[PDB]
Amino acid sequence: DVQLVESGGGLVQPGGSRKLSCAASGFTFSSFGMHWVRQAPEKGLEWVAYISSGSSTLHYADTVKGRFTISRDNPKNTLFLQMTSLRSEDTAMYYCARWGNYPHYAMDYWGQGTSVTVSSAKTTAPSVYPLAPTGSSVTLGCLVKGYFPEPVTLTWNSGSLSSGVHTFPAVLQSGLYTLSSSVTVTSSTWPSQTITCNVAHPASSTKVDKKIEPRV
Amino acid sequence: DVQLVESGGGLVQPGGSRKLSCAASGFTFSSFGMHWVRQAPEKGLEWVAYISSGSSTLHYADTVKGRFTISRDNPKNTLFLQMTSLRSEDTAMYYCARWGNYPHYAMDYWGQGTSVTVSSAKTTAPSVYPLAPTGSSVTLGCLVKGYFPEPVTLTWNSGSLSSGVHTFPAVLQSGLYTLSSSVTVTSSTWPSQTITCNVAHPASSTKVDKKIEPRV
Amino acid sequence: DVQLVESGGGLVQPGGSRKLSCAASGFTFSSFGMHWVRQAPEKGLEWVAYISSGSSTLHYADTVKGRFTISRDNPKNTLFLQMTSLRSEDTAMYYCARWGNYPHYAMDYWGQGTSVTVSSAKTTAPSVYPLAPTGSSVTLGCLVKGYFPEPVTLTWNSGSLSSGVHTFPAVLQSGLYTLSSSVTVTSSTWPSQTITCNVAHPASSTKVDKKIEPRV
Amino acid sequence: NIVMTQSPKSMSMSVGERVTLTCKASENVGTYVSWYQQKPEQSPKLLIYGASNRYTGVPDRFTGSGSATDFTLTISSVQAEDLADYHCGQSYSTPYTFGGGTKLEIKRADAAPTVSIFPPSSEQLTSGGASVVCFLNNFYPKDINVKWKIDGSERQNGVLNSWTDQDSKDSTYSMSSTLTLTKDEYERHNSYTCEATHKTSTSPIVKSFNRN
Amino acid sequence: NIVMTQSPKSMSMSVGERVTLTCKASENVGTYVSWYQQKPEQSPKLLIYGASNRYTGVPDRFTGSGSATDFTLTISSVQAEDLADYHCGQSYSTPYTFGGGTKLEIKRADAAPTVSIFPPSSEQLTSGGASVVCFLNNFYPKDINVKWKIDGSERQNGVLNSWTDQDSKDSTYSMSSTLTLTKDEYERHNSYTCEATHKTSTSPIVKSFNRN
Amino acid sequence: NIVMTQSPKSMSMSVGERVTLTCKASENVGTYVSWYQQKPEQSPKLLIYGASNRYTGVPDRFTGSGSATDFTLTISSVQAEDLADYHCGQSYSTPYTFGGGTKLEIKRADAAPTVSIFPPSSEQLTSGGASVVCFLNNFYPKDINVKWKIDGSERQNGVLNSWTDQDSKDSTYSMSSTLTLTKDEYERHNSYTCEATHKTSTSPIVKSFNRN
């Protein structure tokens, strides 16, 4: 079927530049207009740019005009977004969408989204701290502190522990992100069977595991 | 010249299913009827199935009718055997053969054979034990015990020791196979130059080397 | 699909001769012009020779004219390069390529490359020396010295150790090649679990394993 | 520009009931409003085109309506899997524009938060940091107010609050509250307390420990 | 079904002599019998087609004959490389059928077996197992009978016997005989013996050791 | 001959950014320039034909352009898997010719080299040889200068330097430096030192041992 796949996201400094790609398959690419639409951390969808099937009619949102250029390479079935003079407010998840559903034109198929963060903050792995505490149940935790950019991903016992895990959305303080995660386990079997939070940070290729040790 | 190559063999549980392939080259594949023929551990050749050049006339042996299907993909020059409802008695080496030699129709070209074992026994690496013992000559040995499925392959000093090596055909006891191998070496130079039996078991990707140490 | 496979590479003395082969399948061989192109150790691609589908139009690069002959055997679907009066500068990886992509003629399909070394140096296995050294991590090494011709291949614990292995490209000194390889392992588990570098030298069928022993 | 005002941005509805989402345009549209559903991990998916046509595989429980200036998405009856962000959108003139979105949530029975408090780990302390953490787990509704006290005194400097989205398992919320201190200050006080105000309690729910 | 009865299944012939293999059909055939040679590692190769036509690269020493119900393969004179399995086959009606096959072997001078016996390795013992192994090497003819004794008593439970095919080097046979015991039983007896009966000996050939 | 001058031979670009590779011909071409990508282990693969047509399975991020004398390959945006050698090529007259090639690498953050030094093994010594080895691992950028000292004196005779290509894991470089001595000379000096100069350090990075 129709397939749209994106890449090129990442961290860039303000005033910087970057180029996103959107690969298409399962339809005649050169017969459809295509869109870029974005979605900020808070948030909501925002139309960015449109290009007709043959790259003749191009349209831009007011806030990107003269900074962004949208283009396509029809032989290679690929849609592009060239971003320059980047501002903080350009921080968003970027989606490509097909202008299909003829003759009721609509964004019928969307890519997966590729994340762009625009900041002068640099890429930093998190520190990771175990949070130890009758109950029958006991709650344990994992503090993930001072990383950049978003995201981090959290698992407990490498995915084995599912239910009762709450992973809280990150918050920015003093230039970096912090989040925490909690898990609930049986009180009669802790600590005699081990609990580990695993944290990975895509942007810096960092992975950390942390056993939760008891303390009175 | 005419080339026929097979694959798809392996271990399957009774009642299971499997598909064998036979690749052809060096002749016009779509102009020949093809056969599958099998050969059990004990043994003898047995005709399994026939398919005419254009897949219109198909024939089956009585013991496979309604369980096996023979087919071909002429554009890809490939012959197939689809096996289902597998029994123990289907355990065999499977060959494909071209129905050529017109007008004296005969199975003129054969593939290399691909082995099918049908058993509820599971894949297990062997244990490997050195057998140490005036002679001038001394005989040493290698015991390969409790593996499945067949085969294992045996070498001594990695192929360097050739003559005087006897590797005995496997025997099934208590659900698994056992075999042994012997080699004869000069008495004046053993143990001062080392003798090692090397055992490899295809089905489990296992390889084992074992030095033969003296003992009174 | 389209398949091109080469062979015939190896070591030859200057002034010597050699013949490379390129097998074709998955297309109508006799309907395409074919090329030989080469790539030296340093390096870059270099066009060597062209032959039209029916062997009537042949072209040669200036530096090979009168020394090399390109030919083909259409019934056997094979392309050849006959090399004579070999110089040092003919040392290269040799590729065959199909002249396809009609009507936008281009080298659309390439063989895997077969290596030709032209030298009066003789085939020699390497000597192999373990390089032993707090860290948490410890770095170990493997010195591969005085072999010819290229290449050698390096693994650690027979492929089991992957990440952190760096194998450095060979350098020629005093007529032979030398290279080294490094690996990083956990400091708490060395030497109590063993580390071995394995070296193999295709040209001389030599294989060497070398455990890394500690020393103060 | 055709401005789309979507309301409410947040809406809770009991299973079996009727959800209504409104989208008012600043000027008139077709037949050119579309609706998109966006589930937590995923990209928006087209739900309604035109103003009332369902797209492939969209349940009949989803119906869009309206004309001119005023459009609606109604889902009757709401089911557990309808939890998502819903966005209206005009396809009638550039610039194409979207509403601000609506987060649809399941209404359920009130639940008091289960609270755990955690002193800074020895590993953070040894690095000079001192974050104290309070988990407020499995509560409903989502509005909750957390205050931190140090030796009995309120402290709003260095407090990070974070809410999950509605949990698929039990439709409850959870939130995390972190008081960020330096070790030098942490070592100078004795007691740490997080207090929360929530619908299910007349008095503040309190959790405390003494540093040791 | 056209049943092919091939005899003998096993046949030995001295180099220079005449080998004859018979294949009788349960009903009449062409001109549709073929013969196949199968060397140890390999797939069958077509040898005779029709009933008497040689296939490409088949030595003139190979001749097939027969008609109706009764066919033959004769190789005169047999050479060392003729060692193989030979299979007859009818191509005249489905189901195509094969004979049971004949194993052709070189006849040679009698040879007494050379016997070695091996106690269980320390490595097997430590794992709880106890196989005792006897090699009976380089003998002819192939028929041989092995018995195991434990403390002088015959034991046929746990005995695995295995014969190689004829050895290309000297046309002799070798066989392996393994007595499988548990370590608990092995440790409870003192002496182990394999005894073999063969043409080259009026008395049993014996090999023994005492456990230590 | 149509000479193709390709520049730069070496180019580093941050992920997300724009790579541009130029190819200038000594005389005018079509519509006959092609581009090839060659990943480390493999043969060249056709990337662009004509001057701007993508070949099967070539990502849209790859675009070629140009005419007459001047052509370009641009990849926007560069991704981790774009690391390769890129070659331009004219198909317009014999002799068909290629550019010298461009090695595309990922630009990343500076990294100081981690250095290990190794005395000659006892096994080499016993054979009369004495190579001393320095590993300079996981650094960026790739330019680095290594000097060897023996008893404090610089020595450039017998020094072999070798760089890996960019590492797929972390986009760093590593290099090896070997000082080749005879054992007779090695035994006559006390201390061996490799010193390196790199962007990440104002002073030489040094690693040393005393022979024993």
GROMACS .gro file of C-alpha atoms in nm, chain F residues 56-178:
model
  123
 1128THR     CA    1   1.630   0.193  -0.871
 1129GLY     CA    2   1.615   0.221  -0.493
 1130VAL     CA    3   1.818   0.542  -0.474
 1131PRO     CA    4   1.672   0.769  -0.199
 1132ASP     CA    5   1.527   1.106  -0.306
 1133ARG     CA    6   1.783   1.270  -0.077
 1134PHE     CA    7   2.031   1.202  -0.358
 1135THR     CA    8   2.014   1.454  -0.640
 1136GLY     CA    9   2.252   1.508  -0.929
 1137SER     CA   10   2.274   1.816  -1.140
 1138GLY     CA   11   2.473   2.003  -1.390
 1139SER     CA   12   2.541   2.040  -1.757
 1140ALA     CA   13   2.819   2.095  -2.003
 1141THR     CA   14   3.135   2.117  -1.806
 1142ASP     CA   15   3.011   2.123  -1.453
 1143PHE     CA   16   2.817   1.862  -1.248
 1144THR     CA   17   2.727   1.802  -0.886
 1145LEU     CA   18   2.598   1.543  -0.645
 1146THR     CA   19   2.414   1.677  -0.346
 1147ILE     CA   20   2.274   1.471  -0.063
 1148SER     CA   21   2.033   1.664   0.154
 1149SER     CA   22   2.004   1.567   0.425
 1150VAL     CA   23   2.309   1.348   0.491
 1151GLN     CA   24   2.234   1.040   0.697
 1152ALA     CA   25   2.464   0.794   0.876
 1153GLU     CA   26   2.443   0.537   0.595
 1154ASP     CA   27   2.562   0.784   0.329
 1155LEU     CA   28   2.925   0.717   0.435
 1156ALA     CA   29   3.093   0.595   0.116
 1157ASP     CA   30   3.317   0.673  -0.177
 1158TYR     CA   31   3.141   0.865  -0.454
 1159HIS     CA   32   3.268   0.862  -0.812
 1160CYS     CA   33   3.160   1.062  -1.109
 1161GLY     CA   34   3.186   0.922  -1.459
 1162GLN     CA   35   3.138   1.016  -1.818
 1163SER     CA   36   2.978   0.787  -2.062
 1164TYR     CA   37   3.007   1.003  -2.366
 1165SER     CA   38   3.325   0.903  -2.544
 1166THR     CA   39   3.593   0.650  -2.516
 1167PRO     CA   40   3.799   0.647  -2.319
 1168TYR     CA   41   3.529   0.634  -2.052
 1169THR     CA   42   3.674   0.813  -1.752
 1170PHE     CA   43   3.607   0.852  -1.380
 1171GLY     CA   44   3.674   1.125  -1.128
 1172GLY     CA   45   3.926   1.054  -0.857
 1173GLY     CA   46   3.649   0.988  -0.607
 1174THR     CA   47   3.528   1.154  -0.286
 1175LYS     CA   48   3.527   0.994   0.058
 1176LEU     CA   49   3.219   1.115   0.238
 1177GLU     CA   50   3.243   1.109   0.615
 1178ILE     CA   51   3.020   1.210   0.905
 1179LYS     CA   52   3.130   1.522   1.090
 1180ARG     CA   53   3.091   1.483   1.467
 1181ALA     CA   54   3.215   1.631   1.793
 1182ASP     CA   55   3.591   1.642   1.861
 1183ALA     CA   56   3.724   1.342   2.053
 1184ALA     CA   57   4.069   1.302   2.205
 1185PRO     CA   58   4.249   0.976   2.119
 1186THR     CA   59   4.271   0.700   2.376
 1187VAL     CA   60   4.627   0.573   2.364
 1188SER     CA   61   4.777   0.235   2.450
 1189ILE     CA   62   5.142   0.138   2.408
 1190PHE     CA   63   5.278  -0.217   2.374
 1191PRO     CA   64   5.636  -0.349   2.414
 1192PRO     CA   65   5.747  -0.617   2.170
 1193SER     CA   66   5.613  -0.958   2.273
 1194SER     CA   67   5.855  -1.214   2.412
 1195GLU     CA   68   5.769  -1.430   2.107
 1196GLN     CA   69   5.887  -1.167   1.857
 1197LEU     CA   70   6.199  -1.094   2.065
 1198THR     CA   71   6.293  -1.461   2.065
 1199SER     CA   72   6.281  -1.450   1.686
 1200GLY     CA   73   6.507  -1.144   1.673
 1201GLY     CA   74   6.242  -0.883   1.598
 1202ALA     CA   75   6.127  -0.585   1.805
 1203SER     CA   76   5.822  -0.390   1.697
 1204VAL     CA   77   5.677  -0.143   1.943
 1205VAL     CA   78   5.309  -0.062   1.890
 1206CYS     CA   79   5.090   0.238   1.973
 1207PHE     CA   80   4.713   0.235   1.930
 1208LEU     CA   81   4.543   0.573   1.900
 1209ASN     CA   82   4.174   0.492   1.930
 1210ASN     CA   83   3.836   0.660   1.879
 1211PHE     CA   84   3.931   1.017   1.794
 1212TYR     CA   85   3.788   1.295   1.577
 1213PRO     CA   86   3.880   1.469   1.355
 1214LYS     CA   87   4.104   1.235   1.157
 1215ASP     CA   88   4.417   1.451   1.123
 1216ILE     CA   89   4.670   1.345   1.384
 1217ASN     CA   90   5.049   1.341   1.390
 1218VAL     CA   91   5.249   1.070   1.566
 1219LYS     CA   92   5.613   1.089   1.668
 1220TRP     CA   93   5.822   0.815   1.824
 1221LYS     CA   94   6.096   0.883   2.077
 1222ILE     CA   95   6.367   0.644   2.191
 1223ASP     CA   96   6.546   0.753   2.510
 1224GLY     CA   97   6.391   1.094   2.444
 1225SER     CA   98   6.521   1.123   2.085
 1226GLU     CA   99   6.291   1.144   1.783
 1227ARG     CA  100   6.296   0.849   1.543
 1228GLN     CA  101   6.115   0.839   1.210
 1229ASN     CA  102   6.301   0.547   1.062
 1230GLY     CA  103   6.099   0.226   1.084
 1231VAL     CA  104   5.768   0.397   1.165
 1232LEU     CA  105   5.449   0.258   1.008
 1233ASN     CA  106   5.130   0.462   1.041
 1234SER     CA  107   4.785   0.328   0.952
 1235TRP     CA  108   4.435   0.483   0.982
 1236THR     CA  109   4.104   0.296   0.975
 1237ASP     CA  110   3.814   0.447   0.785
 1238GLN     CA  111   3.537   0.613   0.986
 1239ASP     CA  112   3.384   0.371   1.236
 1240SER     CA  113   3.016   0.299   1.175
 1241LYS     CA  114   2.942   0.275   1.549
 1242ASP     CA  115   3.055   0.621   1.666
 1243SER     CA  116   3.192   0.797   1.357
 1244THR     CA  117   3.537   0.816   1.516
 1245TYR     CA  118   3.873   0.731   1.368
 1246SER     CA  119   4.145   0.509   1.501
 1247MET     CA  120   4.502   0.469   1.389
 1248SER     CA  121   4.796   0.242   1.457
 1249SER     CA  122   5.161   0.343   1.475
 1250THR     CA  123   5.438   0.086   1.475
   0.00000   0.00000   0.00000
